[PDB]
Amino acid sequence: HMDRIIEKLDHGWWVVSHEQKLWLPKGELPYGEAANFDLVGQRALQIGEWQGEPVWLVQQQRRHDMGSVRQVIDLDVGLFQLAGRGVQLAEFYRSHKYCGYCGHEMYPSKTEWAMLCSHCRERYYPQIAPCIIVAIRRDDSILLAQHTRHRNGVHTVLAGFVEVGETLEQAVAREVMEESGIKVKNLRYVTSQPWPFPQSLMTAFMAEYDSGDIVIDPKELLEANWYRYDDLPLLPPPGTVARRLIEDTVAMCRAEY
Amino acid sequence: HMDRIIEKLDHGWWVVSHEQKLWLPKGELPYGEAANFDLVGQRALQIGEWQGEPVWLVQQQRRHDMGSVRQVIDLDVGLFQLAGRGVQLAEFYRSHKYCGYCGHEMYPSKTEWAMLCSHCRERYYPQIAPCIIVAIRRDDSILLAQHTRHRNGVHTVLAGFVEVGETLEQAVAREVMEESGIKVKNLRYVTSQPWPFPQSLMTAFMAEYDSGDIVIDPKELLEANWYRYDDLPLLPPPGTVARRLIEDTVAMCRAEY
Numbered sequence: 001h002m003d004r005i006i007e008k009l010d011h012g013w014w015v016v017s018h019e020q021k022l023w024l025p026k027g028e029l030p031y032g033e034a035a036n037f038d039l040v041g042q043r044a045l046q047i048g049e050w051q052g053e054p055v056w057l058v059q060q061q062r063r064h065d066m067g068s069v070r071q072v073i074d075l076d077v078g079l080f081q082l083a084g085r086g087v088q089l090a091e092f093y094r095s096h097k098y099c100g101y102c103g104h105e106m107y108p109s110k111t112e113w114a115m116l117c118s119h120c121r122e123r124y125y126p127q128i129a130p131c132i133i134v135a136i137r138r139d140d141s142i143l144l145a146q147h148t149r150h151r152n153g154v155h156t157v158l159a160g161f162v163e164v165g166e167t168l169e170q171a172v173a174r175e176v177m178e179e180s181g182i183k184v185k186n187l188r189y190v191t192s193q194p195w196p197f198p199q200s201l202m203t204a205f206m207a208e209y210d211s212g213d214i215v216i217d218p219k220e221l222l223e224a225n226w227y228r229y230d231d232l233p234l235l236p237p238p239g240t241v242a243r244r245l246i247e248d249t250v251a252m253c254r255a256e257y
Numbered sequence: 258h259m260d261r262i263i264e265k266l267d268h269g270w271w272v273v274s275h276e277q278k279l280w281l282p283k284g285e286l287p288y289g290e291a292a293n294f295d296l297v298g299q300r301a302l303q304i305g306e307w308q309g310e311p312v313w314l315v316q317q318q319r320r321h322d323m324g325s326v327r328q329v330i331d332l333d334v335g336l337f338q339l340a341g342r343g344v345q346l347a348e349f350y351r352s353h354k355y356c357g358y359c360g361h362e363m364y365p366s367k368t369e370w371a372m373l374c375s376h377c378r379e380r381y382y383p384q385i386a387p388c389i390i391v392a393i394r395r396d397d398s399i400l401l402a403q404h405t406r407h408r409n410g411v412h413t414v415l416a417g418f419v420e421v422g423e424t425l426e427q428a429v430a431r432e433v434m435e436e437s438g439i440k441v442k443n444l445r446y447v448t449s450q451p452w453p454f455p456q457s458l459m460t461a462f463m464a465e466y467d468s469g470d471i472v473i474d475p476k477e478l479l480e481a482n483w484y485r486y487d488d489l490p491l492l493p494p495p496g497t498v499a500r501r502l503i504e505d506t507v508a509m510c511r512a513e514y
Protein backbone atom coordinates (compact mmCIF):
# COMPACT_ATOMS: atom_id res chain seq x y z
CA HIS A 1 0.00 0.00 0.00
CA MET A 2 1.72 3.16 -1.37
CA ASP A 3 0.63 6.68 -2.20
CA ARG A 4 0.20 7.96 -5.70
CA ILE A 5 -0.75 10.83 -7.94
CA ILE A 6 -4.46 10.87 -8.86
CA GLU A 7 -5.22 10.62 -12.63
CA LYS A 8 -8.27 11.89 -14.54
CA LEU A 9 -10.26 8.69 -14.63
CA ASP A 10 -9.64 7.81 -10.95
CA HIS A 11 -12.91 7.19 -9.21
CA GLY A 12 -14.16 6.29 -5.74
CA TRP A 13 -14.72 7.88 -2.38
CA TRP A 14 -12.56 10.85 -1.47
CA VAL A 15 -11.57 11.57 2.09
CA VAL A 16 -9.96 14.98 1.72
CA SER A 17 -8.62 15.92 5.09
CA HIS A 18 -6.88 18.94 6.70
CA GLU A 19 -6.43 19.84 10.42
CA GLN A 20 -8.61 16.97 11.80
CA LYS A 21 -11.51 17.86 9.45
CA LEU A 22 -12.70 16.43 6.16
CA TRP A 23 -14.28 17.95 3.08
CA LEU A 24 -18.05 17.43 2.76
CA PRO A 25 -19.35 19.54 -0.11
CA LYS A 26 -23.17 19.78 0.01
CA GLY A 27 -22.76 17.95 3.32
CA GLU A 28 -21.88 14.72 1.49
CA LEU A 29 -18.69 12.64 1.26
CA PRO A 30 -17.17 13.15 -2.24
CA TYR A 31 -18.00 10.27 -4.51
CA GLY A 32 -17.10 9.97 -8.21
CA GLU A 33 -14.37 10.78 -10.69
CA ALA A 34 -11.39 12.75 -9.36
CA ALA A 35 -11.81 15.33 -12.10
CA ASN A 36 -15.23 16.27 -10.76
CA PHE A 37 -13.68 17.18 -7.38
CA ASP A 38 -10.58 18.96 -8.78
CA LEU A 39 -8.42 16.21 -7.32
CA VAL A 40 -6.38 15.20 -10.41
CA GLY A 41 -2.63 15.54 -9.72
CA GLN A 42 -3.08 15.28 -5.94
CA ARG A 43 -1.30 12.58 -4.04
CA ALA A 44 -3.73 10.05 -2.56
CA LEU A 45 -3.53 6.89 -0.47
CA GLN A 46 -6.00 4.04 -0.70
CA ILE A 47 -7.25 3.33 2.85
CA GLY A 48 -10.01 0.84 2.01
CA GLU A 49 -12.92 -0.07 -0.24
CA TRP A 50 -16.66 0.51 0.12
CA GLN A 51 -19.17 -1.38 -1.99
CA GLY A 52 -16.30 -2.56 -4.27
CA GLU A 53 -14.95 0.97 -4.88
CA PRO A 54 -11.72 2.43 -3.44
CA VAL A 55 -11.69 4.87 -0.57
CA TRP A 56 -8.87 7.40 -1.02
CA LEU A 57 -7.24 9.67 1.53
CA VAL A 58 -5.94 13.05 0.31
CA GLN A 59 -4.35 15.77 2.45
CA GLN A 60 -5.60 19.07 1.18
CA GLN A 61 -7.38 22.08 2.56
CA ARG A 62 -10.57 23.27 0.95
CA ARG A 63 -11.98 26.79 1.31
CA HIS A 64 -15.51 25.59 2.26
CA ASP A 65 -17.41 22.64 3.74
CA MET A 66 -14.64 21.30 6.01
CA GLY A 67 -16.09 19.55 9.03
CA SER A 68 -15.86 16.96 11.73
CA VAL A 69 -15.95 13.30 10.77
CA ARG A 70 -18.89 12.81 13.21
CA GLN A 71 -21.10 14.32 10.46
CA VAL A 72 -20.55 11.10 8.46
CA ILE A 73 -22.29 8.98 11.17
CA ASP A 74 -25.59 10.53 9.96
CA LEU A 75 -24.73 9.77 6.32
CA ASP A 76 -23.67 6.10 6.76
CA VAL A 77 -22.27 4.42 9.91
CA GLY A 78 -20.16 1.97 7.88
CA LEU A 79 -18.56 4.67 5.70
CA PHE A 80 -18.00 6.69 8.88
CA GLN A 81 -15.53 3.98 10.01
CA LEU A 82 -13.48 4.36 6.73
CA ALA A 83 -13.53 8.14 6.57
CA GLY A 84 -12.65 8.59 10.29
CA ARG A 85 -9.72 6.17 9.95
CA GLY A 86 -8.49 8.32 7.10
CA VAL A 87 -8.64 11.37 9.33
CA GLN A 88 -6.94 9.37 12.16
CA LEU A 89 -4.14 8.24 9.80
CA ALA A 90 -3.40 11.85 8.77
CA GLU A 91 -3.18 12.75 12.48
CA PHE A 92 -0.97 9.72 13.19
CA TYR A 93 1.44 10.90 10.48
CA ARG A 94 1.42 14.43 11.82
CA SER A 95 2.19 13.30 15.42
CA HIS A 96 5.15 11.19 14.12
CA LYS A 97 6.84 13.47 11.64
CA TYR A 98 9.96 13.16 13.92
CA CYS A 99 11.17 10.12 15.74
CA GLY A 100 10.44 10.32 19.50
CA TYR A 101 13.45 8.06 20.23
CA CYS A 102 16.20 9.83 18.24
CA GLY A 103 14.70 13.00 16.74
CA HIS A 104 15.22 12.19 13.02
CA GLU A 105 12.50 12.42 10.40
CA MET A 106 10.13 9.49 9.98
CA TYR A 107 8.40 8.06 6.94
CA PRO A 108 5.34 5.79 6.60
CA SER A 109 5.80 2.01 6.32
CA LYS A 110 4.72 0.55 2.95
CA THR A 111 3.79 -2.88 4.43
CA GLU A 112 1.96 -1.89 7.63
CA TRP A 113 0.16 1.08 9.06
CA ALA A 114 3.29 2.21 10.86
CA MET A 115 5.77 5.01 10.92
CA LEU A 116 9.48 4.06 10.39
CA CYS A 117 12.59 6.07 11.23
CA SER A 118 15.02 7.36 8.62
CA HIS A 119 17.87 6.87 11.13
CA CYS A 120 17.12 4.31 13.83
CA ARG A 121 15.35 0.97 14.05
CA GLU A 122 12.31 2.01 16.13
CA ARG A 123 8.77 2.35 14.82
CA TYR A 124 5.26 3.49 15.90
CA TYR A 125 1.78 2.04 15.38
CA PRO A 126 -1.53 3.92 15.65
CA GLN A 127 -3.10 3.31 19.08
CA ILE A 128 -6.57 2.16 19.92
CA ALA A 129 -7.97 3.72 23.08
CA PRO A 130 -10.24 1.42 25.15
CA CYS A 131 -13.45 3.24 26.01
CA ILE A 132 -16.62 2.41 27.98
CA ILE A 133 -20.19 3.33 27.09
CA VAL A 134 -23.06 2.65 29.46
CA ALA A 135 -26.85 2.81 29.44
CA ILE A 136 -28.22 3.17 33.01
CA ARG A 137 -31.77 1.99 33.65
CA ARG A 138 -33.75 3.15 36.67
CA ASP A 139 -36.99 1.14 36.66
CA ASP A 140 -39.00 2.53 33.70
CA SER A 141 -36.49 5.36 33.22
CA ILE A 142 -33.13 5.79 31.44
CA LEU A 143 -30.35 8.27 32.13
CA LEU A 144 -29.55 10.49 29.17
CA ALA A 145 -27.23 13.47 29.06
CA GLN A 146 -26.44 16.32 26.67
CA HIS A 147 -22.70 16.79 26.29
CA THR A 148 -20.79 20.09 26.40
CA ARG A 149 -18.44 18.91 23.64
CA HIS A 150 -21.12 18.50 20.99
CA ARG A 151 -23.93 20.95 21.97
CA ASN A 152 -26.01 19.23 19.21
CA GLY A 153 -29.33 18.79 21.08
CA VAL A 154 -28.86 15.01 21.19
CA HIS A 155 -29.58 13.15 24.42
CA THR A 156 -27.30 10.20 24.86
CA VAL A 157 -25.72 7.74 27.30
CA LEU A 158 -22.46 8.08 29.28
CA ALA A 159 -19.02 7.23 27.90
CA GLY A 160 -15.33 7.67 28.89
CA PHE A 161 -11.75 6.51 28.38
CA VAL A 162 -10.44 3.54 30.36
CA GLU A 163 -7.59 4.74 32.59
CA VAL A 164 -4.29 3.06 33.59
CA GLY A 165 -4.64 0.16 36.03
CA GLU A 166 -8.47 -0.10 35.62
CA THR A 167 -10.73 -2.94 34.55
CA LEU A 168 -13.63 -2.01 32.17
CA GLU A 169 -16.00 -2.45 35.12
CA GLN A 170 -13.99 -0.03 37.26
CA ALA A 171 -13.93 2.41 34.33
CA VAL A 172 -17.75 2.28 34.10
CA ALA A 173 -18.32 2.89 37.82
CA ARG A 174 -15.69 5.67 37.90
CA GLU A 175 -16.99 7.49 34.77
CA VAL A 176 -20.62 7.36 35.91
CA MET A 177 -19.73 8.58 39.38
CA GLU A 178 -17.54 11.38 38.00
CA GLU A 179 -19.96 12.72 35.36
CA SER A 180 -23.29 12.21 37.13
CA GLY A 181 -22.60 11.26 40.75
CA ILE A 182 -24.65 8.07 40.63
CA LYS A 183 -23.69 4.59 41.82
CA VAL A 184 -24.71 1.62 39.60
CA LYS A 185 -25.15 -2.16 39.93
CA ASN A 186 -25.82 -5.16 37.61
CA LEU A 187 -23.06 -4.15 35.25
CA ARG A 188 -23.29 -6.25 32.15
CA TYR A 189 -21.24 -6.28 29.02
CA VAL A 190 -23.35 -6.38 25.85
CA THR A 191 -21.08 -5.64 22.86
CA SER A 192 -18.10 -3.76 21.35
CA GLN A 193 -17.49 -1.54 18.32
CA PRO A 194 -14.51 0.41 16.98
CA TRP A 195 -14.69 4.21 16.87
CA PRO A 196 -12.44 5.65 14.14
CA PHE A 197 -11.29 9.19 15.30
CA PRO A 198 -9.94 9.41 17.91
CA GLN A 199 -9.33 5.72 17.20
CA SER A 200 -10.95 3.75 20.02
CA LEU A 201 -12.62 0.52 21.06
CA MET A 202 -16.01 1.06 22.70
CA THR A 203 -17.20 -1.57 25.12
CA ALA A 204 -20.90 -1.21 25.74
CA PHE A 205 -22.50 -1.99 29.07
CA MET A 206 -25.97 -2.09 30.55
CA ALA A 207 -26.45 -1.15 34.21
CA GLU A 208 -29.10 -0.42 36.82
CA TYR A 209 -29.39 2.58 39.14
CA ASP A 210 -28.10 1.83 42.66
CA SER A 211 -27.91 5.16 44.58
CA GLY A 212 -27.27 8.91 44.41
CA ASP A 213 -28.71 12.16 43.02
CA ILE A 214 -27.62 13.55 39.66
CA VAL A 215 -24.95 16.24 39.88
CA ILE A 216 -23.34 16.94 36.52
CA ASP A 217 -19.72 17.84 35.86
CA PRO A 218 -20.32 21.02 33.80
CA LYS A 219 -16.97 20.50 32.03
CA GLU A 220 -18.50 17.30 30.65
CA LEU A 221 -22.31 17.70 30.50
CA LEU A 222 -24.82 20.48 30.00
CA GLU A 223 -27.80 18.53 31.32
CA ALA A 224 -28.65 15.03 32.59
CA ASN A 225 -31.91 13.45 33.68
CA TRP A 226 -33.95 10.27 33.85
CA TYR A 227 -36.32 9.92 30.92
CA ARG A 228 -39.31 7.61 30.84
CA TYR A 229 -38.53 4.79 28.41
CA ASP A 230 -41.58 5.27 26.15
CA ASP A 231 -41.23 9.06 26.01
CA LEU A 232 -37.65 9.80 24.96
CA PRO A 233 -36.19 13.07 23.63
CA LEU A 234 -33.84 13.40 20.64
CA LEU A 235 -31.56 10.37 20.41
CA PRO A 236 -28.29 9.49 18.62
CA PRO A 237 -28.62 8.11 15.09
CA PRO A 238 -30.01 4.58 14.45
CA GLY A 239 -27.23 2.05 14.05
CA THR A 240 -24.87 3.63 16.64
CA VAL A 241 -23.83 1.74 19.73
CA ALA A 242 -25.31 4.54 21.86
CA ARG A 243 -28.66 4.22 20.10
CA ARG A 244 -28.71 0.42 20.17
CA LEU A 245 -28.05 0.50 23.91
CA ILE A 246 -30.86 2.93 24.57
CA GLU A 247 -33.23 0.82 22.42
CA ASP A 248 -32.36 -2.45 24.25
CA THR A 249 -33.14 -0.71 27.51
CA VAL A 250 -36.49 0.33 26.03
CA ALA A 251 -37.01 -3.27 24.92
CA MET A 252 -36.44 -4.64 28.44
CA CYS A 253 -38.75 -2.05 29.99
CA ARG A 254 -41.35 -3.10 27.42
CA ALA A 255 -40.83 -6.68 28.58
CA GLU A 256 -41.85 -5.60 32.14
CA TYR A 257 -45.23 -4.08 31.13
CA HIS B 258 4.24 14.08 41.34
CA MET B 259 7.93 15.03 40.76
CA ASP B 260 11.22 13.18 40.80
CA ARG B 261 13.77 13.50 43.53
CA ILE B 262 17.10 12.44 44.91
CA ILE B 263 16.89 9.43 47.25
CA GLU B 264 18.14 10.04 50.84
CA LYS B 265 19.55 7.53 53.34
CA LEU B 266 16.40 6.83 55.29
CA ASP B 267 14.17 6.49 52.19
CA HIS B 268 12.31 3.22 52.30
CA GLY B 269 9.83 1.28 50.18
CA TRP B 270 9.72 -0.81 47.06
CA TRP B 271 12.35 -0.15 44.42
CA VAL B 272 11.65 -0.64 40.75
CA VAL B 273 15.12 -0.20 39.29
CA SER B 274 14.76 -0.40 35.56
CA HIS B 275 17.07 -0.35 32.49
CA GLU B 276 16.37 -1.43 28.87
CA GLN B 277 12.86 -2.89 29.54
CA LYS B 278 14.14 -5.00 32.47
CA LEU B 279 14.06 -4.54 36.22
CA TRP B 280 16.45 -5.44 39.01
CA LEU B 281 15.47 -8.52 41.05
CA PRO B 282 18.34 -9.45 43.35
CA LYS B 283 17.84 -12.96 44.78
CA GLY B 284 14.88 -13.06 42.40
CA GLU B 285 12.94 -10.64 44.61
CA LEU B 286 11.73 -7.06 44.12
CA PRO B 287 13.93 -4.75 46.28
CA TYR B 288 12.18 -3.81 49.48
CA GLY B 289 13.63 -1.73 52.33
CA GLU B 290 15.88 1.23 53.01
CA ALA B 291 17.58 2.81 49.99
CA ALA B 292 20.96 2.48 51.67
CA ASN B 293 20.65 -1.30 51.67
CA PHE B 294 20.29 -1.30 47.86
CA ASP B 295 23.00 1.33 47.17
CA LEU B 296 20.31 3.67 45.90
CA VAL B 297 21.07 6.81 47.98
CA GLY B 298 21.73 9.81 45.70
CA GLN B 299 19.82 8.29 42.77
CA ARG B 300 16.91 10.14 41.27
CA ALA B 301 13.62 8.32 41.86
CA LEU B 302 9.96 8.85 41.02
CA GLN B 303 7.09 7.66 43.18
CA ILE B 304 4.75 5.64 40.92
CA GLY B 305 2.41 4.26 43.61
CA GLU B 306 2.05 2.69 47.04
CA TRP B 307 1.77 -0.94 48.12
CA GLN B 308 0.55 -1.88 51.58
CA GLY B 309 0.96 1.78 52.68
CA GLU B 310 4.59 2.03 51.49
CA PRO B 311 5.83 3.97 48.44
CA VAL B 312 6.79 2.28 45.21
CA TRP B 313 9.73 4.11 43.58
CA LEU B 314 10.94 4.01 40.00
CA VAL B 315 14.69 4.46 39.40
CA GLN B 316 16.48 4.30 36.05
CA GLN B 317 19.74 2.52 36.59
CA GLN B 318 21.52 -0.48 35.21
CA ARG B 319 22.72 -3.19 37.54
CA ARG B 320 25.45 -5.71 36.70
CA HIS B 321 23.38 -8.76 37.77
CA ASP B 322 19.80 -9.97 38.27
CA MET B 323 18.12 -7.79 35.61
CA GLY B 324 15.04 -9.49 34.22
CA SER B 325 11.63 -9.31 32.67
CA VAL B 326 8.76 -7.89 34.69
CA ARG B 327 6.79 -11.13 34.03
CA GLN B 328 8.92 -12.71 36.81
CA VAL B 329 6.99 -10.52 39.30
CA ILE B 330 3.66 -12.25 38.43
CA ASP B 331 4.98 -15.30 40.35
CA LEU B 332 6.00 -13.12 43.31
CA ASP B 333 2.72 -11.13 43.67
CA VAL B 334 0.14 -10.35 40.95
CA GLY B 335 -0.82 -7.02 42.56
CA LEU B 336 2.79 -5.78 42.87
CA PHE B 337 3.33 -6.96 39.29
CA GLN B 338 0.87 -4.24 38.15
CA LEU B 339 2.95 -1.49 39.94
CA ALA B 340 6.37 -2.71 38.88
CA GLY B 341 5.34 -3.27 35.22
CA ARG B 342 3.85 0.23 35.04
CA GLY B 343 7.17 1.54 36.25
CA VAL B 344 8.91 -0.29 33.45
CA GLN B 345 6.23 0.96 30.97
CA LEU B 346 6.70 4.58 32.14
CA ALA B 347 10.48 4.39 31.54
CA GLU B 348 9.75 3.11 28.02
CA PHE B 349 7.14 5.82 27.45
CA TYR B 350 9.75 8.45 28.35
CA ARG B 351 12.32 6.85 26.09
CA SER B 352 9.92 6.75 23.08
CA HIS B 353 9.10 10.49 23.61
CA LYS B 354 12.47 12.04 24.25
CA TYR B 355 11.77 14.19 21.11
CA CYS B 356 8.50 15.67 20.04
CA GLY B 357 6.96 13.75 17.09
CA TYR B 358 5.16 16.93 15.92
CA CYS B 359 8.05 19.44 15.88
CA GLY B 360 11.25 17.55 16.76
CA HIS B 361 12.20 19.48 19.95
CA GLU B 362 13.04 17.82 23.25
CA MET B 363 10.20 16.81 25.55
CA TYR B 364 9.92 16.70 29.32
CA PRO B 365 7.52 14.83 31.63
CA SER B 366 4.35 16.55 32.89
CA LYS B 367 4.29 17.15 36.67
CA THR B 368 0.46 16.96 36.91
CA GLU B 369 -0.34 13.99 34.66
CA TRP B 370 1.39 10.96 33.25
CA ALA B 371 2.17 12.81 30.04
CA MET B 372 5.07 14.07 28.03
CA LEU B 373 5.09 17.86 27.23
CA CYS B 374 7.05 19.70 24.55
CA SER B 375 9.72 22.28 25.32
CA HIS B 376 8.72 24.17 22.15
CA CYS B 377 5.17 23.47 20.99
CA ARG B 378 1.80 22.91 22.63
CA GLU B 379 1.32 19.20 21.82
CA ARG B 380 1.57 16.36 24.32
CA TYR B 381 1.52 12.52 24.52
CA TYR B 382 -0.15 10.06 26.90
CA PRO B 383 0.84 6.42 27.47
CA GLN B 384 -1.43 4.12 25.43
CA ILE B 385 -3.40 1.13 26.55
CA ALA B 386 -3.59 -1.64 23.96
CA PRO B 387 -6.91 -3.57 23.91
CA CYS B 388 -6.20 -7.29 23.96
CA ILE B 389 -8.32 -10.47 23.90
CA ILE B 390 -7.74 -13.66 25.87
CA VAL B 391 -9.85 -16.75 25.29
CA ALA B 392 -10.35 -20.17 26.86
CA ILE B 393 -11.77 -22.65 24.30
CA ARG B 394 -13.70 -25.64 25.64
CA ARG B 395 -14.29 -28.75 23.55
CA ASP B 396 -16.63 -30.97 25.57
CA ASP B 397 -14.49 -32.26 28.49
CA SER B 398 -11.34 -30.79 26.92
CA ILE B 399 -9.62 -27.37 26.86
CA LEU B 400 -7.23 -25.92 24.31
CA LEU B 401 -3.86 -24.98 25.76
CA ALA B 402 -0.76 -23.85 23.92
CA GLN B 403 2.91 -23.31 24.69
CA HIS B 404 4.14 -20.01 23.28
CA THR B 405 7.35 -19.42 21.33
CA ARG B 406 7.88 -16.06 23.05
CA HIS B 407 8.18 -17.46 26.56
CA ARG B 408 9.46 -21.07 26.13
CA ASN B 409 8.74 -21.47 29.90
CA GLY B 410 6.98 -24.89 29.86
CA VAL B 411 3.65 -23.27 30.78
CA HIS B 412 0.51 -24.35 28.95
CA THR B 413 -1.91 -21.50 28.56
CA VAL B 414 -4.86 -20.08 26.62
CA LEU B 415 -4.83 -17.93 23.45
CA ALA B 416 -4.41 -14.15 23.43
CA GLY B 417 -3.80 -11.33 20.89
CA PHE B 418 -4.00 -7.60 20.18
CA VAL B 419 -7.26 -6.11 18.90
CA GLU B 420 -6.65 -4.68 15.42
CA VAL B 421 -8.00 -1.52 13.72
CA GLY B 422 -11.66 -1.67 12.73
CA GLU B 423 -12.38 -4.86 14.78
CA THR B 424 -14.85 -5.61 17.56
CA LEU B 425 -13.51 -7.72 20.50
CA GLU B 426 -15.56 -10.64 19.15
CA GLN B 427 -13.96 -10.32 15.70
CA ALA B 428 -10.55 -10.12 17.38
CA VAL B 429 -11.22 -13.40 19.23
CA ALA B 430 -12.35 -15.31 16.12
CA ARG B 431 -9.46 -13.89 14.05
CA GLU B 432 -6.74 -14.63 16.67
CA VAL B 433 -7.96 -18.19 17.28
CA MET B 434 -8.19 -18.91 13.57
CA GLU B 435 -4.74 -17.43 12.92
CA GLU B 436 -2.84 -19.16 15.75
CA SER B 437 -4.62 -22.53 15.81
CA GLY B 438 -6.88 -22.77 12.76
CA ILE B 439 -10.02 -23.52 14.76
CA LYS B 440 -13.46 -21.92 14.46
CA VAL B 441 -15.34 -21.14 17.73
CA LYS B 442 -18.91 -20.41 18.85
CA ASN B 443 -20.72 -19.29 22.06
CA LEU B 444 -18.34 -16.41 22.57
CA ARG B 445 -18.94 -14.94 25.97
CA TYR B 446 -17.29 -12.10 27.76
CA VAL B 447 -16.40 -12.92 31.37
CA THR B 448 -14.08 -10.18 32.70
CA SER B 449 -11.26 -7.65 32.11
CA GLN B 450 -7.89 -6.86 33.71
CA PRO B 451 -5.08 -4.42 32.97
CA TRP B 452 -1.69 -5.78 31.92
CA PRO B 453 1.14 -3.36 32.81
CA PHE B 454 3.99 -3.86 30.21
CA PRO B 455 3.32 -3.57 27.35
CA GLN B 456 0.44 -1.60 28.88
CA SER B 457 -2.78 -3.31 27.81
CA LEU B 458 -6.39 -4.08 28.67
CA MET B 459 -7.18 -7.80 28.55
CA THR B 460 -10.75 -8.78 27.85
CA ALA B 461 -11.33 -12.39 28.76
CA PHE B 462 -13.70 -14.62 26.88
CA MET B 463 -15.02 -18.15 27.12
CA ALA B 464 -15.81 -20.06 23.92
CA GLU B 465 -16.73 -23.49 22.60
CA TYR B 466 -15.09 -25.47 19.79
CA ASP B 467 -17.03 -25.21 16.50
CA SER B 468 -14.84 -26.74 13.73
CA GLY B 469 -11.32 -27.34 12.40
CA ASP B 470 -8.09 -29.23 13.14
CA ILE B 471 -5.25 -27.63 15.07
CA VAL B 472 -2.49 -26.20 12.90
CA ILE B 473 -0.17 -23.91 14.83
CA ASP B 474 1.54 -20.77 13.58
CA PRO B 475 5.14 -21.68 14.56
CA LYS B 476 6.00 -17.97 14.81
CA GLU B 477 3.47 -17.84 17.65
CA LEU B 478 3.24 -21.31 19.26
CA LEU B 479 5.48 -24.29 19.85
CA GLU B 480 2.68 -26.73 20.62
CA ALA B 481 -1.11 -26.76 21.03
CA ASN B 482 -3.54 -29.49 22.00
CA TRP B 483 -6.80 -30.33 23.73
CA TYR B 484 -6.28 -31.39 27.33
CA ARG B 485 -8.81 -33.26 29.41
CA TYR B 486 -10.15 -30.87 32.04
CA ASP B 487 -9.30 -33.02 35.09
CA ASP B 488 -5.81 -33.89 33.84
CA LEU B 489 -4.08 -30.61 32.98
CA PRO B 490 -0.37 -29.95 32.44
CA LEU B 491 1.60 -27.01 33.88
CA LEU B 492 -0.60 -23.92 34.08
CA PRO B 493 -0.07 -20.15 34.49
CA PRO B 494 0.14 -18.86 38.06
CA PRO B 495 -2.97 -18.74 40.32
CA GLY B 496 -4.57 -15.32 40.31
CA THR B 497 -3.85 -14.56 36.60
CA VAL B 498 -6.67 -14.02 34.15
CA ALA B 499 -5.33 -16.93 32.08
CA ARG B 500 -5.45 -19.24 35.08
CA ARG B 501 -8.87 -18.08 36.27
CA LEU B 502 -10.26 -18.71 32.80
CA ILE B 503 -8.86 -22.22 32.65
CA GLU B 504 -10.25 -22.94 36.15
CA ASP B 505 -13.78 -21.70 35.29
CA THR B 506 -13.74 -24.00 32.29
CA VAL B 507 -12.76 -26.84 34.63
CA ALA B 508 -15.59 -25.78 36.94
CA MET B 509 -18.20 -25.96 34.16
CA CYS B 510 -16.95 -29.36 32.99
CA ARG B 511 -17.24 -30.50 36.61
CA ALA B 512 -20.83 -29.24 36.55
CA GLU B 513 -21.55 -31.65 33.62
CA TYR B 514 -20.35 -34.82 35.42
Ligand SMILES: [Zn+2]
Binds near residue numbers: 119
Ligand atom coordinates in the same frame (compact mmCIF):
# COMPACT_ATOMS: atom_id res chain seq x y z
ZN1 LIG C 1 14.58 7.22 15.23
Ligand SMILES: [Zn+2]
Binds near residue numbers: 375379
Ligand atom coordinates in the same frame (compact mmCIF):
# COMPACT_ATOMS: atom_id res chain seq x y z
ZN1 LIG D 1 6.72 19.81 19.95
